[PDB]
Symmetry: D2
Subunit: 396 residues, 4 copies
């Protein structure tokens, strides 16, 4: 039988993250993906004719046309002979795409892949029912927000992700005040990272050209400057009248992309490129949809166990902040050393472009590891529908 | 470094394929997908607790809710700890899912996976523009058919897959007469198969209940009974008033699903199960979007090479019949022996539910191989956006 | 001061009435209008250049373009110098248009007017909310059935005209049996009148060209052949599950038009044309929206008073059958002699194209009066929003 | 045979005119209508129980519900026994409504009517095709802006009212510079009228109540303070690149209502109320659709002949400024003394809520006549689809 191969990250880049109807609200998911795919390739210094595949996560595919991943790879300038496909694992899509690239490389089926995710929630459409096709006939119908139907509502329970967060908050006893405390801490870490230029290396600018003008978008815009504990404690519950989750202790609706060049190790070295990290393990884990926020627990355990590691071995962790409730409960459950976690801020401040986040956090992890000279890293996140995904990387 | 593993198919099953607004038009893609997932598991006789993952292709995801593959798996009865995700490689999606399943198994990542695809084109929705979200403000807008926008129009050139078929007809000299003759051949072989019970083993019945009456769908309904050369000869071109492509020499818009249980070889034997074929290789290839019908050429060339085989080594072949124009160009380019191709009929008679067709043709191939006691088989198909995928299987 | 003039009907024509999605479902309200306008002019023998105005009732104006009455007159072949406007008094609109034409002639403001009404309920559109113009932003919306929103739901209470009919049933002790008995009688009279050629004189045929083919629509299609007291008594209530109103004891949703030439008496004589009747009086009356079915009471009372008449002086009556419940309550309230009412059947059998019905009953009244050589006629109907209108005509 | 009666205006009121998406954008046309109906009755000091009818113009009736005039009337607090109906003569609706009230009163069918118009263009909906009712089936559709379909595009020619304006400019040689000079002059006269309080008497405040804001709207907000020749001359043409017509020399899309109490003269005196003016005559005229802007020519000539007057007899004139090109063509053709026309500014400055404008200009004329102590007044305006309407009043 063949022998498994080692797989390395050779570059990692992301766009800044746009606010809902903000700076990226006229730049399609596919143009955001093309942008990062191109920049990833440039930064890796790889010969672009040697890219075997592109794998991109994208959750709100409605109306974006055939195979958005292929559209993005073509717009990036890659050759027509470079194949690609679009991954939908909801919030995990962007990391799952990276895991699939690693898997294909490790299994000898390719040598170089560009993998990540992309999402423009601002541009998500509205949907008419199949009933529109066959005819309404008589009586009113419904117009469906696609963000909600395909991206933020649980298809098992018909209620918002928010409510799964509340469920996790009751089950693990995570209080309103614990959530807001975390939220402020994420905002402060983000604000220092942004100010001190910690994200400069990882961000590729996007040129936004409009009828009125052209401008360059290169700074995360979702952070809420000058956030305070009292402002946060003043907010009303978003999803439950008697609830704990608010707009201030939850991530948002956001736009952005991220991509990495993944390569077989001995081929990266023979081509005279510089490996930035090895992909050591990855795993997916499943939980009840009602408690989807806990997905990272089984995923993280499997990934650790597949790497031959203990959690305490890990130097830096990016655990996604879709809701402070789920992020705290996961952290409580596994016993995270929280000073190793989301050291430059997390999604409550930075935003959550769902199909891109999984890859975005991996980008942020690797650059934080390089800046602080750390060796071992963990990226994980919860996934709508009751799943989680995790990946461990080791710096070179 | 780990040793790679062998992957085997342990069951293979499909629904009968529904005509547009036909027998399956009220059964959701997700329910079709659950039916085949459950049936594949039952037929395999595998303990359902041993399923590691479910991978399903699905192209018109718009409005189907979070992660359709995960919904299907939960509906099929699998536990909530079973992970899954949804693949979009357009027409290729369903075979790509099986290829990914086999890769995970080969790589030691999983031991048992259900993979395939599912599509209900009848139930595809209509889409309002992003403008609807931000506001039309003044002036009209458009309401978009999702079938066309995400499934049948080229996102590169903005025209129908029918036009790519016309481009391929010119390039390779495939005339209307040539196209019509293949169409009749296909209708004929499909009718003989139906008549002889050749599809009985592979089809899982779907119960369709409506208040007026409840009925069992178990027979492909797209085939045109009593098709003739004369009748085909009289149709008007569908896409190009001076063209060669018609509704009679192209597949249709259809509903259906297919799935297979795939396992690590030794896990199959340890569970006392009966391997039906080994997956020998698989590959993807890219061609210009304008000539997407030619996708099978580079995919087949790569997959034969990976398998260490020549085209002449293959005993039976399933090459999808999206359009006779591209089916014929492909067979001419590669030198297929046409008596080994689509022996029970192809998509011009059977139908093309896009997300599913790739797994559908593989199911059909395996059963055909079993019926004829053949050893080596190839499944391949073109993909909108200019791709191709192929897989070689070897009977056991 | 000038003195009031006398006004006479010179012609009276209607289309046959179409069922919902029936024979007239692809002929625009405006084309129906033009047909009857043109025909009324031909049958009156008036010089087309002498038409001073066209007044047409039309309730579902949405999407029909500027001033439907004006579009209809232009299509009819009248000169661009002939003015026109569109009236909306809901169910009254068609009779209101005639009353206005008569008032204008009586007041010396014009000599010849064509008036009536037109509706194509089958072609009525659906509406997105103003929120579409501003933008949905986030969250679901509705898509509104214009028939219901602008035609059939009470704008004061938000419930169906249906419910106003249940209200009246109660207020006046009108049982399900009494309603179904009336319904059966209407169906018999109408089938009898159609069989016997009673509508031949008043109906102008419509040429309906479909993509495939052409036919002539000239016979009322809503009547229900072989209606029986038992089938009717078997029906489920349509609007309240403890209710009395059914699809069998109410009119339907329908397509059609009607028009009449009205002239100043002395100018009709000077042109050598034959007055068919004199418009003796007209009136409108108001009642609670909840009891809109009773509108005919004050309208009829006032109209008789303005005509110097008592109910008993009237030889023939057309009292619209929107709902048997209100038609019976009106009849009981006023003491109708039922043998004189709706002698050729009413709307329960014939249909209710709401904009046209007011003119349609008047057309049917005049022709019945001619065939039975009667002298005094009354036409009245109820109007959604709590109104009624009535007109008294005197044959000559 | 009775004798014709005299009709007087007893009150005249309007809302301030809102800009598109401006201060009135959240207030329904019906509410605007109710507001002016109530205020008119209050100003007249009439006993509300003496009101026989309400007749209101309204052009974009789509989705507004049954019989908007009836709704407004009920909303105003009038008794349910008061009938009303809604008029559509496009831009002319509001003045047509007053003419119809006058006609009814002259002809002795009523003694007190409230008449006017109402429009909220900001809240006009979007519409799906009849195809939505029967089903799109396959292929795209359109979503239609009601403002355009029912209110601003020619139903005969399918192009914007602005194009009819270009037709008129070319026909009558009305240059860009002539049009821009008129626009400036109307802006100045409006600014001067606002500065000196000339609108205070005629305007009734509307209370606008939003969660976001609460405030009283009482001042016209479409006029452009500090308009200049140079700014007007720099604007691009709006409807045609070689065109003359711009946003600066055409009226806007606007929201407003206006209404007047009308009464039989002797009943007025008997009631101890003060007649403000006598309605002396009214007429409608027709012209080709393509040249709709010229409609006021035949309407005015008939109105004058019917009143026994020469143009020069008229002391003050309100000729609607839908487009500068049409307004000037009209004045050239009739030889208007411009010093007497639109003395407080016209629609280029004040706006054009289409169903209300015909009433609005009448209210404006009356009050200006009072301020300047003038005796004869003329109100006229052009109408989409190729009509005009005019009215002559005589101050008392």
């Amino acid at each position: 039988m063949g022998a498994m191969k080692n797989c390395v990250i050779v570059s990692a880049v992301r766009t800044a993250i746009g606010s809902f109807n903000g700076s990226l609200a006229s730049t399609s998911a596919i143009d955001l993906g093309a942008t990062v795919i191109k920049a990833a390739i440039e930064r890796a210094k790889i010969d672009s004719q040697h890219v075997d595949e592109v794998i991109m996560g994208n959750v709100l595919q409605a109306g974006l046309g055939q195979n958005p991943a292929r559209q993005a790879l073509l717009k990036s300038g890659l050759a027509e002979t470079v194949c690609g496909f679009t991954v939908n694992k909801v919030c995990g899509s962007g990391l799952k795409s990276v895991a699939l690239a690693a898997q294909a490389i490790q299994a000898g089926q390719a040598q170089s892949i560009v993998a990540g995710g992309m999402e423009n929630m601002s541009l998500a459409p509205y949907l008419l029912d199949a009933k529109a096709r066959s005819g309404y006939r008589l009586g009113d119908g419904q117009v469906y927000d696609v963000i909600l139907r395909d991206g933020l509502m649980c298809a098992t329970h018909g209620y918002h992700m928010g409510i799964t967060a509340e469920n996790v908050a009751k089950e693990y006893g995570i209080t309103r005040e614990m959530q807001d405390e975390l939220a402020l801490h994420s905002q402060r870490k983000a604000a220092a990272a942004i100010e001190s230029g910690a994200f400069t290396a990882e961000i590729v600018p996007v040129n936004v050209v409009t009828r009125k003008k052209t401008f360059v978008f290169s700074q995360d815009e979702f952070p809420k400057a000058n956030s305070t504990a009292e402002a946060l404690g003043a907010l009303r519950p978003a999803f439950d009248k008697a609830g704990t989750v608010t707009a201030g202790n939850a991530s948002g609706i956001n736009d952005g992309a991220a991509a990495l060049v993944i390569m077989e190790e001995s081929a990266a070295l023979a081509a005279g490129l510089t490996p930035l990290a090895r992909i050591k393990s990855y795993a997916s884990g499943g939980v009840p949809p009602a408690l989807m926020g806990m997905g990272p627990v089984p995923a993280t355990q499997k990934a650790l166990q597949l790497a031959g590691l203990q959690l305490a071995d890990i130097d830096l962790i990016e655990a996604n902040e879709a809701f402070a409730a789920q992020f705290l409960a996961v952290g409580k459950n596994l016993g995270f050393d929280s000073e190793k976690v989301n050291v430059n801020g997390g999604a409550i401040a930075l935003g959550h472009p769902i199909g891109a986040s999984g890859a975005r956090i991996l980008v942020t992890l690797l650059h934080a590891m390089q800046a602080r000279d750390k060796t071992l890293g963990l990226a994980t996140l919860c996934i709508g529908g009751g799943q989680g995904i995790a990946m461990v990387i080791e710096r070179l």
